[PDB]
Amino acid sequence: RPWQMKDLQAIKQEVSQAAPGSPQFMQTIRLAVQQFDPTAKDLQDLLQYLCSSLVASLHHQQLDSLISEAETRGITGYNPLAGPLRVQANNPQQQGLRREYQQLWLAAFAALP
Numbered sequence: 001r002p003w004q005m006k007d008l009q010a011i012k013q014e015v016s017q018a019a020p021g022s023p024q025f026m027q028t029i030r031l032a033v034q035q036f037d038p039t040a041k042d043l044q045d046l047l048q049y050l051c052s053s054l055v056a057s058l059h060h061q062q063l064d065s066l067i068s069e070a071e072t073r074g075i076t077g078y079n080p081l082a083g084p085l086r087v088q089a090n091n092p093q094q095q096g097l098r099r100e101y102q103q104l105w106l107a108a109f110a111a112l113p
Contacts, residue, residue, distance in 0.1 A: 021113045076096060
């Protein structure tokens with residue numbers, strides 16, 4: 001049950017005025033992420049739709065650092081012999097990795113301003 005075009009259009013329109021990482025944007029994006037239960041691929045699509053290449057790159061770097069610390073510590077469900085967290089989160093049998101990816105994503109995007 002992935003999102004459709006209308007959901008993305010509403011998500012972008014409702015937060016057109018606000019700035020990335022504002023409390024309003026964080027509310028709406030967090031609700032979307034917690035409601036649709038998407039993988040990393042869909043999150044990348046959503047970010048490309050919402051913010052430009054500059055904000056995309058900044059979030060990419062911040063999320064790289066956050067994932068770096070998180071999975072360098074060692075995580076309950078992460079096994080580094082199978083692939084990067086971006087790929088484990090895309091397997092529907094690793095929901096723990098998917099939820100960790102979602103939370104790192106939202107925190108990284110919130111850490112912009």
